[PDB]
């Protein structure tokens, strides 16, 4: 791979050649080709599935969401030349996007008739049945998450940051709740590192000790980081990250800061996150014993939406963790408000 | 500005300072804040405009309908302050993008009430009323188009390619059927040249003399290339050239190429076409003094799907000036089927 | 252009659940931007609000009513809904719904009300 | 908990003159008051918000003033449609609390 990189600040133009890592976040809104095993092949897995119990698909990402959506038409149209009374439906997603009990199996036949290589001109679109394969919409009452299958595919080549371009993913064998590293890189140089993939862009810095410095997060994903993928794995307790493990979090030392411990109860439901160790606007944070415990992230705003101005931690560190969302600012677990009653706030009803 | 670029075919680089042309097609599906005037001055030209008899807007670009929607609601929400019984009703476009006679008027006093700084985060949406001012979409018959307004805006400024930058436009005190020139860029290095904006991208090289080499057109509009942004103005013909002036081609040497003329009756209704000197698949072209004269473009497949095999001309150059469109090639106005009467194939109904 | 459609029983014999729901036309409720609160006016006597509810899940309930009100979201009818047990011959009012704006005060939209009165 | 106080509690009068209602909050509520207008058989509307900011489609002689634990609501010229109960509301503080109304009376 060969590249030139500059720096604007002072003056520095580099090249050479090594192993760069871009930040793809939002790499899903982009226009790509999306190949599936094979039309047959896939038209047979999802047969198979749905003769086994499984009534849908709970997605791991957004990428996965799209592909689904690519593929919809002409997985819809073969199926029905094999006679098969069954649709697939694609939905939205919702964040948290939790984790499914299921798989979808490889078959070793792939159905007949159909035909090659996704991305057919022409073709007569398929009429609609009673049977329904769905793919992440407000169904939960249709079937639960329990009867869907989650991670089940893998990729194999892909062309992300370059439009128009393929990619190639597979239906995979075993069982894992492991993230797809095929699109994840963590690079550090110097006293910056950084831990990314096409939903994640997290970095740390060193300060003193090595600590989390802010995170960008645009899907809340439910596997886990790799360890081939991560810095600084070892001698690290799961109590103390900060992104819980069970959100993708990575194991690392980087993924912690003085003072506070693992978010389980942070707003999860949001669409979008920013993770950032500052004060909210008319907001100051006071360090003191007699504050209160741990408990649910609270909103600085009211529901009127008046501003809560004092607020107060056992021991944690300045500045104070937050999250900013669309509708505007959380705390973290360890800050509280000072006076105002805590059944007054929003709060956050998602645990990880 | 200053720049750094790399040509990575001979692995070479150059920094300093100039003038930068970029390929910025397409620039409209992006995420950008825009500012038309004041959201009270706004207001006051629209109503005015609808106590005037102007019944609506026809767009000139995509850009211009992009602002129409992202403004709509504060628009409505405003001018329901006042009592004003007017609803902004917003559309989608179709090429070509058609002129219009009227023109905005500039305000004098601006609405009362209504507020400053578009953008507000909370307000109370409008209701809607029975009478509608329409923007672009499939409503000719509601009003037609002598009675709408076009090409009212300029920008002042912008951060085209910077996402998330404001774009800041202005309601225009003139007349014209110029383009805007503030997105403009034109640039010649050697034995090549371009000519772009948001929505063009011509490329001219030089041969024996200099002919058009390639275009790029995601969308047809009817304004004028302005002259300062054009190479080679003078001692220039209006019928030699290639895309007509009345679809905002550059009047220049740049825009012709040798044995043919101007193509008035082309594809233009298409969402997006690329100009091309190459055969299309399965087709030979033929120069020939017996073969038939010039008319409508004709698709190279017929409605069936049979491709047509044989095509002739009297006094072309080859290649053939052929459109790329999503249904599949036109072929110009100056190449005829040889065998296939004309009656049996795709013709093109437009006229520039 | 959002309506508010509030129904329920006309009549609670005393001791029994009271039950209401509120049906929403011309938008969602699942949008962002909102919450979904109830309130009641007794006959003769002035109004009283109950609480409110979130789509994500945050509630607030009235002291007043000391742990006997529960409120729901059922997106598949497009409706949110209340339950106020044990009840009373002080329960009779007019019961509306109401959709607010988040962040801006309490600028609401209400429902038309229904009457339900609490006897034998 | 916060107990809001709605005085005159009643009164009449004539198409043209001055109609004026007080409300008073039992602690300091900086600026989220608002006002609501009920005709009989009718949900209550809301007419004004934040004090003073007026809801589109509300005639422009309604208006209000106050700070802190006072606050007002003027009818510069009553009209006749204005024969209504009118309340005051905060949202300074879960529960949303109501005064106990003043009843406008269109006097002939």
């Known amino acids: 791979h060969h590249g030139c990189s500059v720096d604007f600040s002072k003056k520095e133009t580099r090249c050479g050649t090594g192993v760069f890592v871009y930040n793809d976040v939002e790499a899903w809104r982009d226009r790509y080709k999306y190949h599936p095993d094979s039309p047959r092949r896939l038209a047979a897995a999802v047969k198979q599935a749905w003769e086994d119990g499984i009534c849908g698909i709970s997605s791991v990402s957004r990428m996965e969401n799209i592909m689904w959506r690519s593929v919809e038409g002409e997985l819809n149209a073969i199926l029905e030349e094999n006679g098969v009374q069954l649709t697939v439906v694609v939905g939205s997603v919702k964040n948290p996007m939790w984790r499914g009990p299921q798989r979808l199996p490889v078959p070793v036949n792939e159905l007949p008739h159909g035909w090659k290589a996704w991305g057919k001109s022409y073709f007569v679109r398929a009429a609609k049945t009673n049977n329904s394969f769905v793919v992440d919409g407000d169904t939960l009452k249709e079937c639960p998450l329990k009867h869907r299958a989650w991670n089940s595919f893998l990729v194999e080549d892909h062309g992300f940051g370059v439009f128009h371009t393929s990619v190639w993913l597979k239906v995979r064998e075993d069982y894992s709740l492991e993230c797809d590293p095929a699109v994840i890189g963590t690079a550090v140089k110097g006293k910056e590192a950084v831990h990314s993939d096409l939903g994640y862009w997290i970095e740390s810095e060193k300060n003193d000790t090595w600590r989390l410095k802010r995170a960008h997060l645009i899907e809340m994903k439910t596997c886990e980081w790799p360890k081939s993928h991560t810095l600084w794995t070892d001698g690290i307790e799961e109590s103390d990250l900060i992104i819980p493990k069970s959100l993708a979090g990575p194991l690392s030392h980087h993924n912690t800061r003085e003072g506070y411990r693992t978010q389980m109860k942070g707003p999860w439901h949001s669409e979008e996150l920013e993770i950032r160790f500052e004060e909210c606007p008319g907001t100051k944070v006071h360090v003191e014993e007699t504050c209160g415990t741990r408990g649910p992230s609270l909103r600085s705003t009211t529901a009127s939406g008046r501003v809560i101005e004092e607020w107060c931690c056992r021991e944690c560190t300045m500045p104070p963790l937050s999250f900013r969302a669309k509708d505007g600012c959380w705390y973290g677990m360890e800050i509280r408000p000072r006076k105002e009653p805590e059944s007054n706030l929003v709060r956050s009803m998602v645990t990880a | 500005h200053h720049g750094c670029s790399v040509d990575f075919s001979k692995k070479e680089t150059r920094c300093g300072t100039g003038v930068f042309v970029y390929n910025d097609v397409e620039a409209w599906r992006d995420r950008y804040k825009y500012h038309p005037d004041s959201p009270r001055r706004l207001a006051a030209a629209v109503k005015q405009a609808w106590e005037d008899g102007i019944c609506g807007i026809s767009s000139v670009s995509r850009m211009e309908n992009i602002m129409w929607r992202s403004v709509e609601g504060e628009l409505n929400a405003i001018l329901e302050e006042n009592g004003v019984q007017l609803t902004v009703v917003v559309g989608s476009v179709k090429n070509p993008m058609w002129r219009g006679p009227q023109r905005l008027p500039v305000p004098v006093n601006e609405l009362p009430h209504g507020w400053k700084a578009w953008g507000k985060s909370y307000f109370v949406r409008a209701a809607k009323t029975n009478n509608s001012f329409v923007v672009d979409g499939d409503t000719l018959k509601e009003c037609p188009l002598k009675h709408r307004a076009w090409n009212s805006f300029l920008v002042e400024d912008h951060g085209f390619g910077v996402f998330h930058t404001s774009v800041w436009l202005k309601v225009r005190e003139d007349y014209s059927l110029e383009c805007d020139p503030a997105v403009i860029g034109t640039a010649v290095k050697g034995k090549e040249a371009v000519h772009s904006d948001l929505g063009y991208w011509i490329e001219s090289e030089k041969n024996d003399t200099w002919r058009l080499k390639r275009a790029h057109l995601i969308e047809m509009k009817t304004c004028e290339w302005p002259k300062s942004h054009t190479l080679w103005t003078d001692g220039i013909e209006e019928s030699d050239l290639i895309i007509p002036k009345s679809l905002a081609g550059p009047l220049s040497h740049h825009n012709t190429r040798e044995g043919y003329r101007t193509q008035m009756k082309g594809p233009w209704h298409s969402e997006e076409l690329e100009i091309r000197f190459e055969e299309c698949p399965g087709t030979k072209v033929h120069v020939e003094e017996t073969c038939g004269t010039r008319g409508p473009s004709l698709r190279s497949t017929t409605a069936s799907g049979r491709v047509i095999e044989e095509w002739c001309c009297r006094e072309c150059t080859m290649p053939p000036l052929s459109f790329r469109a999503k249904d599949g090639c036109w072929y110009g106005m100056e190449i005829r089927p040889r065998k296939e009467p004309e009656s049996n194939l795709v013709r093109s109904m437009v006229t520039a | 252009e959002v309506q508010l459609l509030e129904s329920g029983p006309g009549l609670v014999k005393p001791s029994q659940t009271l039950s209401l729901t509120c049906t929403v036309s011309g938008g969602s409720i699942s949008s962002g931007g909102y919450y979904w609160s109830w309130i009641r006016q007794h006959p003769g006597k002035g109004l009283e609000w109950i609480g409110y509810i979130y789509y994500s899940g945050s509630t607030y309930y009235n002291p007043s009513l000391k742990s006997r009100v529960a409120m729901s979201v059922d997106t598949s009818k497009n409706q949110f809904s209340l339950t106020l047990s044990s009840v009373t011959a002080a329960d009779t009012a007019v019961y509306y719904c109401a959709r607010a704006i988040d962040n801006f005060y309490d600028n609401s939209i209400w429902g038309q009300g229904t009457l339900v009165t609490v006897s034998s | 908990d916060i107990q809001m106080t709605q005085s005159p509690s009643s009164l009449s009068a004539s198409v043209g003159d001055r109609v004026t209602i007080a409300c008073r909050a039992s602690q300091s509520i900086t600026n989220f008051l608002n006002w609501y207008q009920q005709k009989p058989g009718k949900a209550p509307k809301l007419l004004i918000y934040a004090v003073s900011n007026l809801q589109s489609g509300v005639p422009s002689r309604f208006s209000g003033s106050g700070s802190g634990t006072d606050f007002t609501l003027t009818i510069s010229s009553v009209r006749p449609e204005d024969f209504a109960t009118y309340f005051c509301?905060?949202?300074?503080?879960?529960?949303?609390?109501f005064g106990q109304g003043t009843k406008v009376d269109i006097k002939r």
């Open positions: 509301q905060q949202s300074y503080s879960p529960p949303y609390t």
